Design a protein around this ligand. Structure first.
Ligand code: HEM
Ligand code: HEM
Ligand code: HEM
Ligand code: HEM
Lengths: 145, 141, 144, 141
């Protein structure tokens, strides 16, 4: 649960976030910092070097779609489990994705928002976003069985 | 950081296992899939039911891997070089799952070795399993 | 969330559990396997050897108390947030205990239960106990 | 292990910090206390408000500790031998809190180094910070 001031601070920053480019940056840095998360993208091509990961076109397409659903969850911060219920079943029953990757992606996104906004990413803003990425990661793992 | 007391306890504890390694590995695997269902994402289309030959087959492989690790406690990085490479570049299992399997191995040993699972051996086995997990995750990045 | 078959087998196993002896065994094993948890029990006395830890009278006299929320969670199944609204303030605003140590004790309690019950601690029985120790630890950490 | 590219990236990244280490250490600590309030249990009588000299004082100590680690990257277990003993036998800080401080250090570096926090430097710093935590936690048991 987030407070109105916490919900307003998180929403205000997202209003300046370009879901298209930032999505390809978070997913790219996730595959570079944590290279064991590349087991789901063998058909994407080559991901051996960082410049290959950030330069992969298929990675940038999946990043915009991933952060796109994340953008929809921000409008429903009071019901993340129901919002990501269908995606949680698909990632589990069909994609077989380890829910820990949701926590690794959340850590990367916080670093990307800090690297892009700099001083605007204040410690209180980060703490508000730490609860958002934790709720989205738990919501995407809620339907795992 | 394994102490000589730890090597003595782990060798004595795993020595009592012996021919029960294949059965204990299948039990610890079933305990992991039941207690931590997120680990089942790494074995898709596998038969994970109780008494499954698919589960019993892989349980012996992990047990033989731990049996070789006990005999090569002083040469663990070189003994598990083939498994560390497989788990890092082929399986790519998240390192958080190693703590789940290590915990279920301790539960299987405690339930099956009541006389040898002393608090000293318990601490020695937890440190040993943490060292095996660290070795298998050393080549991840 | 636990099933009625899960809650029935867990309560059946806990009926044969001696909270005094099991608590002192789980609390002592936690200090032996994870020695960095001794920072909160410096007043307990000799904690150098594992024999001195298990035989420490203050350890056994407090093991029956630490296992209370596990015994308390075994009656208030789910909705543990309101159940653990005062025990958190004790370990938080007074002693300032790391909630991670509560997770280590839950895993240690599972090892103690398996060592005490043997085959009776079936993988399904353990899986049901893991949900209990995971819900209690998360509820105790929600008020930090 | 730390690759030569990692040592080059971490040395280049920390080189841009320079005299801002003491100020950045206080920022990463405040970010840890705000994002993870459970870490405040280890500083019970510290003044944790904004602009607290206690936070800036300890923030410079952790920063100077990391500065010495970068210069002795190839000899890190030796350089942090005195600090590993304090955190293991005196502070007894749970090893899970080191990942929280390492994450907040990465967030502070990314916010202050926009031209240098490349994905290669990001991956290099995460491995280096994980190595600092492993060294400081090696003497725990
Ligand atoms: C906030 C976290 C995440 C969100 C919101 C998200 C969202 C999505 C969406 C919307 C899809 C497409 C579903 C459809 O086709 O209708 C998808 C698919 C997928 N996701 Fe995620 N995702 C997240 C995290 C992750 C992570 C961390 C991984 C792996 C490291 C992952 C792996 C995949 C894969 C492999 C696919 C299939 C892509 C394809 O085959 O085209 N997801 N996800
Ligand atoms: C001490 C920890 C572990 C040991 C000793 C171990 C050992 C082994 C061994 C011996 C194999 C067979 C390799 C071969 O036949 O070529 C294997 C395969 C495998 N392991 Fe592990 N493992 C450990 C941890 C884990 C964990 C925690 C997971 C998942 C949560 C995992 C997932 C897998 C998978 C998916 C395979 C491939 C199965 C197959 O393709 O048949 N491993 N491991
Ligand atoms: C998880 C459920 C727990 C319960 C139900 C519990 C119960 C209690 C009780 C009944 C007391 C004494 C009440 C009083 O005298 O005011 C107490 C105090 C204490 N607790 Fe806990 N405890 C738990 C967990 C922990 C943990 C995780 C730690 C340390 C990491 C811990 C360390 C202590 C210590 C050192 C004391 C003071 C002992 C004394 O004053 O005699 N307890 N707890
Ligand atoms: C990046 C990893 C870390 C480094 C390099 C580091 C370094 C240091 C240094 C240099 C000191 C001062 C020692 C002295 O003045 O004698 C210290 C003390 C201390 N550290 Fe850490 N530390 C790290 C992680 C942590 C974490 C995660 C915690 C838990 C929140 C922690 C808790 C403490 C405490 C409580 C003190 C004593 C503070 C005082 O008494 O003034 N440390 N550490």
């Amino acid at each position: 649960h987030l407070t109105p001031a916490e919900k307003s601070a998180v929403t205000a920053l997202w209003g300046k976030v370009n879901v298209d480019e930032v999505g390809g940056e978070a997913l790219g840095r996730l595959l570079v910092v944590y290279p064991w998360t590349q087991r789901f993208f063998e058909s994407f091509g080559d991901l051996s070097t960082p410049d290959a990961v950030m330069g992969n076109p298929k990675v940038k397409a999946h990043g915009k779609k991933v952060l796109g659903a994340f953008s929809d969850g921000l409008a429903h911060l009071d019901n993340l489990k129901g919002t990501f219920a269908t995606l949680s079943e698909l990632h589990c029953d069909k994609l077989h994705v380890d829910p820990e990757n949701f926590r690794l992606l959340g850590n990367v996104l916080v670093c990307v928002l800090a690297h892009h906004f700099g001083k605007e990413f204040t410690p209180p803003v980060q703490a508000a976003y730490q609860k958002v990425v934790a709720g989205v990661a738990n919501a995407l793992a809620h339907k795992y069985h | 950081v394994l102490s000589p007391a730890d090597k003595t306890n782990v060798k004595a504890a795993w020595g009592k296992v012996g021919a029960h390694a294949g059965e204990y590995g299948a039990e610890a695997l079933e305990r992991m899939f039941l207690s931590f269902p997120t680990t089942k994402t790494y074995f898709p289309h596998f038969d994970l039911s109780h008494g499954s030959a698919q589960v019993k087959g892989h349980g012996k492989k992990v047990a033989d891997a731990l049996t070789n690790a006990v005999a090569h406690v002083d040469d663990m990085p070189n003994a598990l070089s083939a498994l560390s490479d497989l788990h890092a570049h082929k399986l790519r299992v998240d390192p958080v799952n190693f703590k789940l399997l290590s915990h279920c191995l301790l539960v299987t040993l405690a339930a099956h070795l009541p006389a040898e699972f002393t608090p000293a051996v318990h601490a020695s086995l937890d440190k040993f399993l943490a060292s095996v997990s660290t070795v298998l995750t050393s080549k991840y990045r």
